[PDB]
């Protein structure tokens, strides 16, 4: 059914993403989401493809939807954080990088980011 097709589309997205086919990835993930709109990982993955395209607003909206579906999605915070730091919104980035560390204390990406953001906040 569509539930099963959705995971197939996700997996095709992941292959596209791994080969740097960023638009193809976006398009697979869009279809994944159209078939199953209640999966935080599908949105979080699409954010990642958008980040690579410099589509930062779209990445943010997607990380923001991923958190609605699942508050504990670590990568949604890391990725929204990155898009914000890219859009020079350093206060908002730090909040997200801080929250990722609340969920995943050892997270190396959030700790590197906090240190870099310190000298802008």
């Amino acid at each position: 059914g569509n539930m099963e097709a959705s995971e197939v589309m996700k997996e095709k997205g992941n292959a596209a993403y791994k080969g740097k086919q960023w638009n193809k990835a976006v398009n697979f993930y869009t279809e994944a989401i159209k078939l199953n709109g209640a999966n935080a990982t599908y949105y979080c993955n699409r954010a990642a493809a958008f980040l690579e395209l410099c589509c930062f607003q779209q990445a943010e909206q997607d990380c923001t939807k991923a958190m609605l579906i699942d508050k504990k999605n670590v990568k949604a915070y890391l990725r929204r954080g990155t898009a914000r730091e890219s859009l020079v919104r350093y206060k908002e980035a730090a909040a997200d990088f801080r929250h990722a560390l609340v969920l995943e204390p050892q997270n190396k990406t959030a700790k590197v980011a906090e240190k870099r953001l310190r000298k802008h906040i």
């Binding site: 992941n14 791994k18 979080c44 670590v74 990568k75 890391l78 990725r79 995943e104 990406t109």
Partner: peptide, 8 residues
């Protein structure tokens, strides 16, 4: 560890 460069 969540590696932000990896999709899931």
């Amino acid at each position: 560890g969540s590696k932000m460069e990896e999709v899931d």
